């Protein structure tokens, strides 16, 4: 089968930059290549077909080049509406095949997270489980590391985290990490701590509480 | 003003089948060839299949051979995708779009998935059973800004919506993507940052709505005593 | 169909996503709710033509792609030198000549018509000449009735089917 790949997988750029992203086909696909733009949670949008033909209504700052196995999409001058994931796609009478996509996010100044930690509620404890939540608010860039410690014991494999999409107003990210424990185990221990590593911090930040206080 | 309208979200046990529909309106012609593309949570786009605008016969990614059948009702401008032997990894939002013959080269013509797309149909495939969430407070504790929130725990299926103070509080709200726990239930947190000088005095309520289980909860979040 | 020969100009571009290019393969039902809403015939660059070109004497004849000197060409009108010389299907005797075709972006074009006020295949304000791509060029005539008619143009008898409202 023909396999489409893209590079790079992610790109940070500023409003006004020239941006070029790349798409490769495992075999020759002539000019039968299209580009799609997709914002989170919404349907994709066709931008370019026949390698270089702009779809009706698409701004001229978009362009596409290439033939055979190597293709590019170019934005001559990035605009706020352009931050999105871009997928290439080979089409023929029998199938469509998408590439894995390239996410372009808006570069801004580095920003350290504000860190907060939340003990489990007494209501939840009554039910048999304890969730401890750690919040990293409004940071940039996206890379961040959370480490959980319970009475200095490093927790591995019993947390889950998720990250919002880049904020439309300040362009930062926020992250939540939830440590799951049984009630009996939660009540065996005193110091619950969340340690955060991020570019904007000269050294890691710890927020902690003592159970009960 | 062509529109594509999909049927509603579905919840299925593994091994069962689902049949999702896409109806066109506002068109120049009564019927259009329709194709289907899905996207699993956090993943890329994956073409599934549709009707060919040339042969008016189904065409599929053969990854789905033997468990996808595509049909069309000409009198109701509707196309159906039936996916059988469902597996958890079939959990995804399924979109439809016209597969439209757009240009020709050398006597051969080429079709593209063109605008407008359908709104999407969430299909969840799981042995879990429908269940509404428990809502727990994330309670404020420094400096000029305080954080508080709600933990929306152990529900199935997606989605839940969270608002604050009935929509009067939107700035500074972060409602995180849900996570799927090894129990098979989802969990989601929603937080907001507020002036510390408000903690005694402004009331904060997270409005949680889980339409699949018909569960609505308004939970007041106050500083712990 | 008869249109998929290399002498048909096939420069099609459904920029507005009407579906008209699909109508050329598979016969499609038009949305009738959209229906209610003297030029000379010369030489048309093939680059602005999609699908077969018909002229009417009033009898219908197809015009294939040639170069600008009338030599038939077989590249689907994709060569910059390809044309449709409509007037080479005009009979030497007769005041009745019109043609019709689809342009690149799916609009029906017309030239000439009855002597005169009616252009292309239209005989009267309620009748046009029937021909194999009438429903593609004129989808709003789908329920017109077919009548056998006889016409005399400068003395020669023409026997054709008219579709009439
Ligand atoms: C299909 O038609 C559209 C117009 O409906 C073409 O769009 C313009 O094409 C020209 C020349 O290629 C560009 O300079 C314009 O920027 C395009 N946009 C405008 C103003 O409509 C389109 O190129 C045609 N596509 C093909 C493949 O023939
Ligand atoms: C196909 O025909 C349409 C309709 O005549 C053309 O669109 C017109 O273009 C002229 C300029 O050349 C404008 O003044 C009109 O307003 C347009 N009319 C409409 C309703 O669009 C179209 O440009 C033609 N395309 C080709 C490739 O020949
Ligand atoms: C036909 O056109 C009318 C008027 O736009 C529209 O309301 C209707 O949805 C169209 N029918 C179909 C099946 O597209
Ligand atoms: C033609 O008649 C058919 C059958 O009664 C009807 O469905 C269709 O809408 C009509 N079309 C037009 C153009 O009036
Ligand atoms: C054009 O089509 C005819 C059949 O209609 C065929 O015999 C001829 O070889 C074709 N020529 C080219 C250039 O493909």
TrEMBL record, chain C:
- Parts forming coiled coils: none
Glycosylation is annotated at 6, 13, 31, 79, 87, 143
Q: Give the subcellular location.
A: Host cytoplasm; Host endoplasmic reticulum membrane; Host lipid droplet; Host mitochondrion membrane
Q: What are the disulphide bonds in this sequence?
A: 12-50, 35-140, 41-111, 55-99, 116-117, 127-164
The UniProt similarity line reads: Belongs to the hepacivirus polyprotein family.
Recorded protein name is Genome polyprotein
Task: State the organism's lineage.
Answer: Viruses, Riboviria, Orthornavirae, Kitrinoviricota, Flasuviricetes
Of the parent protein, the shown chain spans 248 to 475 of 576
């Amino acid at each position: 089968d023909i396999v489409m790949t893209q590079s790079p997988s992610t790109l940070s750029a500023s409003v006004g930059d020239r941006v070029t992203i790349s798409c490769r086909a495992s075999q020759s696909i002539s000019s039968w290549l299209a580009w799609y733009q997709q914002k989170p949670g919404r349907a994709p949008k066709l931008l370019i077909y026949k390698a270089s033909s702009l779809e009706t209504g698409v701004p001229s700052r978009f362009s596409g080049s290439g033939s055979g196995t190597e293709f590019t999409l170019t934005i001559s001058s990035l605009q706020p509406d352009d931050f999105a994931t871009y997928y290439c796609q080979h089409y023929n009478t029998y199938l469509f095949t998408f590439g894995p996509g390239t996410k372009v996010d808006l570069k801004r100044t580095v920003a350290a997270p504000s860190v907060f930690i939340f003990p489990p509620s007494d209501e939840q404890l009554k039910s048999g489980t304890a969730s401890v939540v750690c919040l990293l608010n409004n940071f940039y860039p996206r890379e961040a590391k959370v480490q959980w410690k319970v009475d200095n014991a490093l927790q591995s494999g019993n947390s889950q985290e998720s990250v919002t999409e880049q904020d439309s107003k300040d362009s930062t990210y926020s992250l939540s990490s939830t440590l799951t424990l049984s009630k009996a185990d939660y009540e065996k221990h005193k110091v619950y701590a969340c340690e955060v590593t991020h570019q904007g911090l000269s050294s890691p930040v710890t927020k902690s509480f003592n159970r009960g206080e | 003003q062509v529109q594509l309208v999909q049927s509603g979200a579905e919840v299925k046990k593994p091994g069962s089948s689902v049949k999702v529909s896409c109806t066109t309106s506002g068109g120049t012609y009564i019927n259009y060839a329709i194709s289907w593309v899905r996207q699993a949570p956090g993943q890329g786009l994956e073409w599934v299949g549709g009707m060919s605008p040339i042969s008016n016969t189904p065409k599929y990614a053969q990854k789905f051979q033997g468990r996808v059948t595509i049909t069309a009702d000409e009198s109701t401008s509707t196309t159906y995708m039936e996916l059988s032997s469902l597996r958890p990894e079939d959990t995804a939002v399924y979109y439809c779009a016209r597969d439209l013959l757009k240009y020709c080269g050398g006597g051969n013509c080429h079709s593209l998935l063109v605008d407008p797309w359908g709104q999407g149909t969430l299909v969840t495939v799981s042995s879990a059973s429908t269940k509404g969430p428990s809502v727990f407070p994330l309670a404020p504790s420094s400096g000029g800004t305080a954080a508080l929130g709600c933990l929306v725990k152990d529900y199935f299926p997606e989605p839940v919506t969270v608002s604050w103070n009935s929509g009067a509080l939107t700035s500074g709200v972060h409602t995180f993507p849900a996570v799927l726990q090894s129990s098979g239930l989802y969990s989601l947190s929603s937080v907001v940052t507020v002036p510390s000088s408000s903690l005694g005095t402004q009331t904060y309520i997270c409005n949680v709505n889980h339409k699949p289980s018909n569960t609505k909860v308004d939970k007041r979040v106050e500083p712990k005593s | 169909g008869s249109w998929h020969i290399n002498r048909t100009a096939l420069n099609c571009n459904d920029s507005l996503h009407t579906g008209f290019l699909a109508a050329l393969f598979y016969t499609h039902k038009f949305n009738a709710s959209g229906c209610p809403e003297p030029r000379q015939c010369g030489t048309i660059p093939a680059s602005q033509v999609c699908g077969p070109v018909y002229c009417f004497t009033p009898s219908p004849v197809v015009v294939g792609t040639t170069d600008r000197f009338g030599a038939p060409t077989y590249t689907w009108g994709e060569n910059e030198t390809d044309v449709l010389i409509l007037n080479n299907t005009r009979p030497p005797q007769g005041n009745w000549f019109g043609c019709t075709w689809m342009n690149s972006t799916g609009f029906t074009k017309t030239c000439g018509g009855p002597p005169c006020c009616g252009s292309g295949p239209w005989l009267t304000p309620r009748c046009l000449v029937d021909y194999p791509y009438r429903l593609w060029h004129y989808p709003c005539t789908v329920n017109f009735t077919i009548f056998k008619v006889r016409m005399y143009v400068g003395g020669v008898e023409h026997r054709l089917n008219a579709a009439c409202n």
